[PDB]
């Protein structure tokens, strides 16, 4: 360590992380979407990796959860062309629409979080957050 | 007052979160604690609310928690009303040390003024909500 850390920094950061989760969840709930962070994560992986195998989803995170998502018409399982006993994962039209809607919710929550800052302030914040990682 | 939003901010914040999440898990594994953050959350609630019942704990965590509680019990970290054992108390304390250290290491590259500036900007964001 060079100097003791400011004792308010970890809590101030945690509060922002808390705000983002709380707001996203509240919006999802207000909007009647019945989605949890695990749901959002699963939809994102399936969209990002079309035809994802179940074990590969397992690695990046389940059979019960896919069953739920399939029943809600968000995910479709197709047989693996080489292995008829296993299934690969795809978003339905509805599941894709919901994934992209969830993404727009997340970006709006961030926009609303940051918009009270002036452009100079926002740029300073980017720099400081980046400084934490760059080093 | 609402300004246009810098498109680097959400990714910058997300990157910090993901870095910290990864580092905490790496340090828990480095110390062979065999815990994940949800496990520590259970231990922390049991520590803070010593004697609370299983149903109550389950609700606060928000079958599957009973599985985790049973796993923590099988490791003699939790005893039965729920209490941390001596081993559970020690491992919870060690996890907290790790959480604190990872955050110290996160903010280390910032000078005291940078640290104070970051506190202020994070506060300003929140206060306007």
């Amino acid at each position: 360590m060079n100097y003791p850390v400011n004792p308010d920094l970890m809590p101030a950061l945690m509060a922002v992380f808390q705000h983002v989760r709380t707001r996203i969840q509240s919006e999802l709930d207000c909007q009647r979407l019945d989605l949890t962070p695990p749901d959002v994560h699963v939809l994102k992986l399936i969209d990002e990796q079309r035809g994802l195998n179940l074990q590969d989803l397992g690695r990046q995170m389940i059979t019960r959860k896919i069953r739920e998502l399939e029943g809600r018409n968000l995910v479709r399982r197709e047989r693996n062309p080489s292995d008829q006993r296993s299934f690969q994962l795809f978003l339905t039209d509805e599941g894709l629409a919901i994934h992209l809607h969830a993404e727009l919710i997340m970006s709006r929550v961030h926009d609303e979080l940051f918009a009270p800052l002036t452009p100079v302030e926002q740029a300073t914040l980017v720099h400081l957050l980046d400084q934490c990682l760059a080093a | 007052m609402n300004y246009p939003v810098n498109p680097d901010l959400m990714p910058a914040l997300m990157a910090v979160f993901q870095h910290v999440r990864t580092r905490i898990q790496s340090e828990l594994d480095c110390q062979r604690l065999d815990l994940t953050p949800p496990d520590v959350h259970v231990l922390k609630l049991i520590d803070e609310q010593r004697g609370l019942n299983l149903q109550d704990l389950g609700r606060q965590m928000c079958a599957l928690i009973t599985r985790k509680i049973r796993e923590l019990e099988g490791r003699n970290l939790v005893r039965r009303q729920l209490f941390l054992t001596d081993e559970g108390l020690a491992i919870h304390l060690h996890a907290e040390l790790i959480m604190s250290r990872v955050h110290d290491e996160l903010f280390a590259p910032l000078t005291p003024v940078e640290q104070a500036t970051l506190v202020h900007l994070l506060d300003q964001c929140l206060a306007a909500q």
Partner: peptide, 24 residues
């Protein structure tokens, strides 16, 4: 016990939960 004071305290308390489950 002001707004951001309370949020900081609550968030610090929930740190394991927040890193354990998030949309990030």
């Amino acid at each position: 016990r002001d707004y951001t004071e309370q949020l900081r305290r609550a968030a610090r308390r929930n740190a394991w939960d927040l890193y354990g489950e998030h949309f990030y």
